[PDB]
Amino acid sequence: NMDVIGERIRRIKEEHSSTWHYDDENPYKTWAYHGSYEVKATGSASSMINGVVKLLTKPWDVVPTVTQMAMTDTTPFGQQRVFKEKVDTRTPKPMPGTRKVMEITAGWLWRTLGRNKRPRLCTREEFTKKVRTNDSARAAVEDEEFWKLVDRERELHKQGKCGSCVYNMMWLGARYLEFEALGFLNEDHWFSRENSYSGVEGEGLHKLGYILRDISKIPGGAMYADDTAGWDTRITEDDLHNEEKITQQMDPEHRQLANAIFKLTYQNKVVKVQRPTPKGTVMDIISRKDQRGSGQVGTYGLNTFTNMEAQLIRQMEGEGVLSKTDLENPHLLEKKITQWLETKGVERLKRMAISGDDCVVKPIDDRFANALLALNDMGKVRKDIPQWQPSKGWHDWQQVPFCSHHFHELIMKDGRKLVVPCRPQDELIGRARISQGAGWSLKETACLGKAYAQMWALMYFHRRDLRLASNAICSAVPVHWVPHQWMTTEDMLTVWNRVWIEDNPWMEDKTPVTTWEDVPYLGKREDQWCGSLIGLTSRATWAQNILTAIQQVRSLIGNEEFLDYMPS
Ligand SMILES: CC(=O)Oc1ccc2oc(=O)sc2c1
Ligand SMILES: [Zn+2]
Ligand SMILES: [Zn+2]
């Protein structure tokens, strides 16, 4: 406990020797509380509306989901409330047999993931380049020799000590050191689909639907997509020990630094959290030994790894490999587990799409639906369902939720088929109406709106309202103002052809599309089912007079150069 985190706590208290105290009105139940000092609030109850896209989406002024997205509470008041929900709980220890199959599966999964690639340290030059292309963390620290502070803390890590690696709910220094030891998982694409079979790292939203359709071709039962209640809070001490096994593939200098990250920063953590008190705002210093910190490099990759392991074990239980007697058995035999992993594991990974805590799996049959002993005992309890009620799956991949989307198959006029991402339209419009940052000119606000308009033309062109609104936004913003593929000056029909035709591996016929008229929409019934306002008179009035709203935005912007992108 204190031998690992003590030095960090001593430096925090010494820096704030004035106003340091032990408040017993602290609410912490499952975290170790250490002390508090005096800062005052950072955050807001709601953020600003993007006025450009708001002026151009008037019928959605009267939509409750759009209004709610007036940002969440980042104030210390709102910060303490998120803490009560799930962060301040304890996950029960898994049973001894459960712990063993997790260890066996983790060993096999890391060896499979490391079959072609080798771990490596990441570099100051990589970290610096990443920042520039996107005790405070800015683009201003990497040009200053603050790398000597990084250098001094690394020497502590090499001795098994930690001095200043703390996260809140040098800071950039702690995150560089984590990137240095574990950044290879992301930078060398360990969870790409080719390397991990279940992963989708770097695939991109326009590919996820095609992947789901490919999974549907595998013989088996329904497709299951269970959400876990607060996944990051359900990462156990056993989970962290299993994730640590990647260090066995490292060179000793690398192993030493990654072992320091795992033991001192993941399996012992020191956290700052703001709290309101009748005297004001207060920064509390807390610590615990399990759960995952969301503000960390490698959070995504390690969550993907542990979810891959968890879903494999659930497939195991569905197929009869694991029983309740096995999960309780402290002397469980490895044989049947290893044999299943070596004969079936890769085939079973291919039945899954897994992005962090988000998973889709198509097991060999539907026994999986009621295979819940290991899933619950591992702590990955499903959200908003009785603990032992069978999972409900889908027999249409187009109904499966993944990455906050579902995916529609679209027949183009020329007969070729697209697979497009989609979500309830109010979520897309509600997000595009939110800017963040207080001191943002009309120009920066117009550029962000243009950025949303280009994403809509590239990803959501098939929704009638969004293509209209996207065209209206781009007509209202100067053509020469410029805001992953939707941040450029290229003609959006050109970018569309590159993404959906040219570089699309599921499009055999590379024949380019020459007009937006050849770019299809969802069927009208599906468009309305997914939130379209087409068919309402307030939408027809908006569409009919949209040039008026465009010209009003142009009048206020000034005498810049505008192009008309023809919105009705
Ligand atoms: C064929 C065509 O002109 O389509 C578009 C649509 C939106 C848009 O926003 C830009 O910056 S360029 C651009 C082109
Ligand atoms: Zn440290
Ligand atoms: Zn849809």
Residue numbers in the entry: 272 to 405, 419 to 453, 476 to 789, 801 to 885
Original authors' sentences:
In order to understand the inhibitory mechanism of RK-0404678, the crystal structures of the NS5 RdRp domains from DENV2 and DENV3 were determined in the complex form with RK-0404678 at 2.43 and 1.97 Å resolutions, respectively. The DENV2 RdRp structure revealed two RK-0404678 molecules bound to two distinct sites (Sites 1 and 2), while the DENV3 RdRp structure showed only one molecule of the compound bound to Site 1. Site 1 is a pocket formed on the thumb subdomain, and is ~30 Å distant from the RdRp active site. In the DENV3 RdRp structure, RK-0404678 is bound to the same pocket, but its location is slightly shifted as compared with that in the DENV2 RdRp structure. The benzoxathiole ring of RK-0404678 contacts the side chains of Cys780, Tyr882, Met809, Glu760, and Lys756, while the acetate group interacts with the side chains of Trp833, Asp808, and Leu810 (right). In the DENV3 RdRp structure, no electron density corresponding to RK-0404678 was observed at Site 2, and Tyr607 is in the unflipped conformation. Although contribution of Site 1 differs between DENV1 and DENV2, the current structure of DENV RdRp bound with RK-0404678 at Site 1 provides a new framework for the future development of effective RdRp inhibitors against flaviviruses.
Non-structural protein 5 (NS5) is the largest viral protein, comprising the N-terminal methyltransferase (MTase) domain and the C-terminal RNA-dependent RNA polymerase (RdRp) domain. The RdRp domain is essential for both positive- and negative-strand RNA syntheses during replication. The structure of RdRp is often compared to a right hand, and is composed of three subdomains: thumb, fingers, and palm. The thumb subdomain contains a so-called priming loop, which extends into a double-stranded RNA binding site, and is hypothesized to undergo a conformational change during the de novo initiation of RNA synthesis.
